[PDB]
């Protein structure tokens, strides 16, 4: 609409983006659980 | 919500996001090193 | 109220808003780190 | 009117913008409630 | 009084107003933090 | 007259501007009443 | 006296006036903060 | 004369300018009276 | 004496005059604040 | 003669300029009398 | 002696003269303030 | 001769220049007499 | 996931990745040298 | 799609990229195991 | 000796001469102020 | 010869220049005599 | 794996590699000189 | 594909690059063995 | 010896000579002021 | 020859230059004799 | 191995090689001078 | 191939380059042997 | 030996020579002023 | 040859240059003799 | 070995060579002046 | 050996040679002034 | 080949270059022998 | 060869250059003999 991507190219990029972000957040959550097990900060 | 990719470039956005995430991780790791209670490299 | 998007660019607004919100979060977290009563990384 | 969007593109962006802002503010409110239960500042 | 919008651009004015208001809020909050009697982050 | 807005577009912007500024000032007044209840400065 | 508006641009004059008034208010408020007898944020 | 405004556009702007400046000066005078009742400086 | 306005521009002259008058007033007020005998904000 | 103004525009500007300068000087004189009654400097 | 106005521009000369006179007056007033015997704002 | 003024415009300017400078010097002389009566420096 | 190479240049990405990895390795090695408990060149 | 590579050139680069990154991560893991046997940090 | 004006511009020679004379007078007055035996503003 | 002035314009400027410089030097001499009667420096 | 030479120029890559290797060797030799235990030019 | 080299010029460059890098790494390994026999760091 | 004016511009030679002579006189007068035995403004 | 002056314009400038320089040197010599009478430096 | 001369210029390469070799020799000689055990100019 | 040299010019430059580098390395080896006999560093 | 003037520009040579000779005289006079044994302005 | 002067302009400049340099060196020699009679430095 | 002159400009090579040789001689002479054992201008 | 002047320009070479020789003489004289044993202006 | 010199101009320059460098090195060697008889450094 | 001088303009310059350099070196040698007679440095 403004960059050049159609709604099918945007839905193709959005799905992979959400999957990658979810994997990143899962790794982050596991790391933070390990950190809390190591040294709780609250 | 996918329509953000018609407003934001998939690559420039993605490069900026990766760079900001890397700088944020560096900053958080440096802040925890500056705190004696959370420095893991002393001991 | 939606007509603001006919005055302000959806993408440049979003970029500026996200940048200012990130800098604001960094500033608030740094201010709370500089306050001993609210530093969570000491202890 | 000034930037190029019509009333339908501006109302479509406004709805998603308001939903995202509401989700952001809800997460912020939960975080601030947790912070108050952690360390009240007033 | 609406005629000011025929003299002042609705958007450059509005962006400048929002920026100045944000900077003013930052300044007032920083001043109250520098004053011990009104610093809410100590204690 | 000087920027490009007609009188109807200026009256349309002025109404929304005044409503938004009034909401902002109401929130500001509530916050300042709360601040006076917390720590009066005069 | 209205003819000053045929000499001075209504918008650039008005923007400059508003900016100078804001800077003057900031200056006067800061001067009163730097004076112990008129600092209202101490005590 | 030199900016572009006629005597009617300059008189239209002058009236609103004077009204706004008078309102500003009235608010300023009230604030200064309040400040004198708070802490006289002379 | 009015012929000075055929040499000097009514607007640029007037802007410069107002600016120098404002800076002169600021300077005189700041000098009196730097003089303990004439500082009205102490006491 | 040099900047563009005629002798009628220069005499029209001169009258208003002199009136404004006289008002400014009168206000200045009143302020200086008040200052002298407040704190003489000579 | 009037022929100087055919060599020196009546306006740029006049602006320069007014500026130099103002700066000279400021300098003389500042020199007398820096001299304790002639400072009139002390005492 | 060098700037553009004729000798009638230069003599028109010279008379007003001399009158203004003489008034300035008279005010300066009065101020200096007042200063000498206030604090002689020689 | 391979489609990222249709968004990102295989060579500028790769050069940037190698440079950031090298700088990261240098930084981590320097941080471990600045920590006495993990400095391997002392002793 | 955006740079110029087709999906066959992107799948050819992706395979080699993933193999190289896997080898790099394996060397990194071996080095980190050796470092842990040398000086554990947690 | 008048032929110097066929070599030197009556206006730039004259402006430069006036400027150098003014700077020279300022310098000589400042030097006499820096000398206690000839400072007339002390006493 | 080099700037543009003829010998009549140069002799007209030279006479006024010499008169002005002589007046300046006379004022300077009077001031220096007064300074010597005030504080001799040799 | 050879196809990297169709992405990366053999010469600029090679110059960059040689320069980075030289700077890395200099850095490692300077770090070992700064460490008393591994300085071979003392004693 | 991207810089201009064919598969035969890249395979010719890759072989020499790998040979040179292997010789460099062998010299480096010998140097590091000598360093360990001189001053072990672990 | 007059042929020097066919090699050296009279106006630039005069301007440079006068400037150098003025700077030389200023320098010599300043050096004598820095000389206590030859300072005529002390006493 | 090199700047533009002929041999007659150069001889005209040289004579006045030498006269002015001789007058300057005579004033300098008188000043230096007075200085030696005031404070000899050798 | 000679094919490197079809990739690297015999002259620029050679100039760079000579320059780096000279700077390396200077550096090694300065380092040995900064080491008291290997300074040959002391004694 | 990339600079302009043919293989006959590159081979004929390579021989001279290798001979010069070998002479340089031999001189360096003799110098380092002399340095070791002067002051061993290991 | 005169042929040097077919090689060197007479005016640029003369200007450079005069400038260097003046700077040399200044330097020598300043060096002798900095030497107490040869300062003629002390005493 | 290189600047533009012929052998007659270069010989005419050389003679005056040598005469001026000789006069300068004679004045310098007299000054240095006077300096040696004032304060010998060797 | 003469063919180096077909690669290296005979004149920028001799200028650079002469300049580097002069700088090297200056460096070596200054290093011996900074070494007390080899300073020939002390004593 | 004269062929150097077919390679080196006489004027630029000669000017550079004279400048370097002058700077070298200045440097050598300044070094002897900095050495107490060879300073001829003390005593 | 690369600068412009032929194989005879380069050979002509090389001979004079080598002779000059040999003379320079001979002077350097004599100076170094003198310096070693003055102050040996090894 | 590179500048423009022929073999005769270079031999003419070389002779004068060598004569001037020889005179300079003779003056230098005399000065250094005098300096050694004044203060030997070796
Ligand atoms: C403080 C006590 C703990 C510790 C607990 C924390 C906690 C808690 C976390 C980390 C996180 C990280 N820590 Mg830590 N960490 C410690 C000490 C270390 C030290 C060290 C020298 O000791 C190192 C170098 C690391 C390194 C890291 C990274 C693996 C990771 C941040 C990467 C990042 O910013 O991606 C962000 C930037 C990107 C570009 C990501 C983009 C992702 C996309 C999908 C993939 C594209 C490839 C991209 C270019 C790189 C991806 C890298 C991976 C996502 C890691 N930690 C110690 C001992 N650390 C975080 C993590 O796990 O994140 C994954 C995390 O949650
Ligand atoms: C001070 C005591 C508390 C604490 C209480 C507070 C409180 C109270 C709050 C936070 C908030 C945040 N804190 Mg905190 N916080 C603490 C310590 C930390 C530390 C740390 C190293 O310990 C980390 C790194 C964080 C990090 C954060 C972020 C998760 C978040 C601010 C994000 C932001 O600025 O978005 C702003 C920028 C944007 C671009 C947001 C845009 C949103 C849109 C809809 C989504 C688009 C994606 C966008 C690019 C990124 C979205 C990020 C998420 C919204 C977080 N906190 C401690 C222990 N913190 C705030 C929060 O919850 O925000 C959500 C919040 O209210
Ligand atoms: C000093 C004792 C009090 C306190 C009392 C005060 C008082 C009194 C006030 C605030 C106000 C604010 N305080 Mg506070 N405040 C405190 C400590 C904090 C801390 C902290 C880390 O503790 C935070 C981050 C804040 C943050 C804030 C913001 C919510 C707000 C200023 C926003 C602004 O400048 O908009 C200005 C800029 C704009 C662009 C506004 C434009 C409005 C239009 C209509 C909406 C468009 C969207 C726009 C882009 C953003 C709108 C933001 C909201 C209006 C807030 N306060 C404490 C504990 N604070 C003020 C407020 O309520 O303002 C609303 C206010 O009156
Ligand atoms: C020192 C002891 C006294 C004091 C005695 C003095 C004396 C004595 C005088 C002032 C004057 C002024 N004082 Mg005070 N003043 C004091 C302390 C203050 C403090 C403070 C924080 O305490 C404030 C903010 C001021 C402010 C001022 C201004 C109202 C005014 C200078 C305006 C100016 O420069 O216009 C100059 C610039 C212009 C552009 C004027 C142009 C006029 C034209 C005709 C109008 C066009 C509009 C123009 C843009 C703005 C007009 C402003 C008004 C003319 C003031 N005073 C105290 C307590 N002050 C002076 C005054 O009255 O001036 C009118 C004056 O004579
Ligand atoms: C702290 C206690 C340990 C130690 C434990 C750690 C740990 C744990 C690790 C290292 C890693 C490394 N250490 Mg260490 N390290 C120590 C001391 C040293 C010293 C020293 C002066 O003593 C040096 C020279 C090194 C050097 C190294 C490198 C070999 C390597 C980082 C390379 C890199 O960043 O690639 C990143 C940049 C690239 C461009 C990589 C790209 C990879 C692709 C596939 C190949 C292309 C070629 C590319 C240009 C270069 C490849 C290099 C290799 C992958 C190494 N270590 C000590 C004694 N070090 C890490 C490693 O093994 O990485 C492989 C690692 O995990
Ligand atoms: C040191 C002890 C004495 C003293 C003795 C000396 C002596 C002795 C002399 C001065 C001179 C001057 N002194 Mg004093 N002076 C003292 C203290 C002062 C103080 C002070 C704050 O106390 C000031 C304001 C001055 C100011 C002056 C000026 C009136 C004058 C230098 C003007 C100039 O440089 O023109 C130079 C620049 C020009 C452009 C002149 C050009 C002339 C042409 C023909 C006219 C064109 C108009 C031109 C633009 C301005 C003319 C100004 C007048 C010629 C003055 N004196 C004390 C108390 N002073 C000198 C003087 O009288 O000069 C006339 C002088 O000889
Ligand atoms: C530290 C104790 C020793 C000492 C032992 C070491 C050791 C060990 C070595 C040197 C080497 C050198 N030492 Mg040492 N050295 C000492 C003190 C000195 C002092 C001094 C004033 O005290 C001087 C000036 C030198 C100078 C030198 C150079 C002769 C040489 C490095 C030149 C170079 O970098 O070429 C590199 C740059 C080039 C451009 C070379 C290019 C070669 C090509 C084929 C020829 C083209 C001509 C080129 C432009 C210049 C050639 C120069 C020669 C090859 C030297 N040494 C002392 C007393 N020194 C090294 C050497 O012998 O190198 C040959 C060496 O191995
Ligand atoms: C150190 C103890 C002695 C002393 C002994 C020395 C000795 C010994 C010598 C000087 C020389 C000079 N000294 Mg002394 N000198 C002393 C103190 C001073 C003081 C002072 C404030 O006390 C002054 C200002 C001077 C000034 C001078 C100059 C007259 C002259 C250097 C001019 C020059 O550099 O021309 C160089 C620049 C030029 C451009 C010259 C060009 C010549 C051509 C032919 C003429 C063209 C005109 C040209 C533009 C200017 C000519 C100026 C004259 C040649 C002087 N001396 C004391 C008391 N001085 C030297 C001299 O006599 O030079 C002539 C000299 O030999
Ligand atoms: C240290 C104890 C001695 C001393 C012993 C040394 C020794 C030993 C020497 C000098 C030399 C010089 N000394 Mg000494 N010198 C002393 C103190 C001084 C003092 C001082 C303030 O006391 C000064 C002004 C000088 C000045 C000089 C110069 C005359 C000369 C360096 C000129 C030069 O660099 O030309 C180089 C630059 C050029 C451009 C030369 C070019 C030559 C061509 C052929 C001519 C063209 C004209 C050219 C532009 C200028 C020629 C100048 C003359 C050649 C001098 N000496 C004392 C008291 N000095 C040297 C000398 O005699 O050189 C001739 C020399 O060997
Ligand atoms: C076009 O080609 C034709 C057709 C003409 C054929 C010709 C081909 C030719 C002539 C090819 C020639 C090829 C050559 C000469 C190749 C040479 C290759 C070499 C020497 C490769 C070497 C590689 C070395 C690498 C990649 C080393 C990497 C090291 C790293 C990344 C180290 C990192 C260290 C870190 C980040 C951390 C620790 C270090 C310390 C502790 C210091 O940090 C503080």
Residue numbers in the entry:
A (entry chain T), D (entry chain R), F (entry chain P), H (entry chain N), J (entry chain L), L (entry chain J), ...: 6 to 47
B (entry chain U), C (entry chain S), E (entry chain Q), G (entry chain O), I (entry chain M), K (entry chain K), ...: 1 to 43
Give excerpts from the publication.
The genome of the mildly thermophilic hot spring purple sulfur bacterium, Allochromatium (Alc.) tepidum, contains a multigene pufBA family that encodes a series of α- and β-polypeptides, collectively forming a heterogeneous light-harvesting 1 (LH1) complex. Here, we use the purple bacterium Rhodospirillum rubrum strain H2 as a host to express Ca2+-bound and Ca2+-free Alc. tepidum LH1-only complexes composed of α- and β-polypeptides that either contain or lack the calcium-binding motif WxxDxI; purified preparations of each complex were then used to test how Ca2+ affects their thermostability and spectral features. In both complexes, each αβ-heterodimer subunit bound two molecules of BChl a and one carotenoid.
By contrast, in the Ca2+-free LH1-α2β1 complex, the regions corresponding to Ca2+-binding sites remained empty, consistent with the Ca2+ binding pattern in the native Alc. tepidum LH1−RC, further validating the authenticity of the Ca2+-binding motif WxxDxI. However, the overall structures of both LH1 (α1β1) and LH1 (α2β1) complexes are still quite similar, with the main difference residing at the C-terminal region due to the longer sequence of α1 compared with α2. The Qy transition of the LH1-α1β1 and LH1-α1β3 complex (both containing the Ca2+-binding motif) occurred at 894 nm, whereas the Qy of the LH1-α2β1 complex lacking a Ca2+-binding motif was at 888 nm. In contrast to the Ca2+-bound complexes, and as expected, Qy absorption of Ca2+-free complexes was entirely impervious to the influence of calcium ions, EDTA, or alternative metal ions. The spectrum of the Ca2+-free LH1-α2β1 complex was similar to that of the native LH1−RC, while both the intensity and peaks of carotenoid absorption in Ca2+-bound LH1-only complexes differed. For the Ca2+-free LH1-α2β1 complex, the denaturing temperature was markedly decreased to 73.4 °C, slightly lower than the native LH1−RC complex. Tepidum, where a mixture of 14- and 15-subunit LH1-only complexes were detected, all Alc. tepidum LH1-only complexes contained 14 subunits. It is noteworthy that among the three Alc. tepidum complexes constructed, the thermal stability of both Ca2+-bound complexes was comparable and distinctly better than that of the Ca2+-free complex, further confirming that enhanced thermal stability of the complex arises primarily from bound Ca2+.
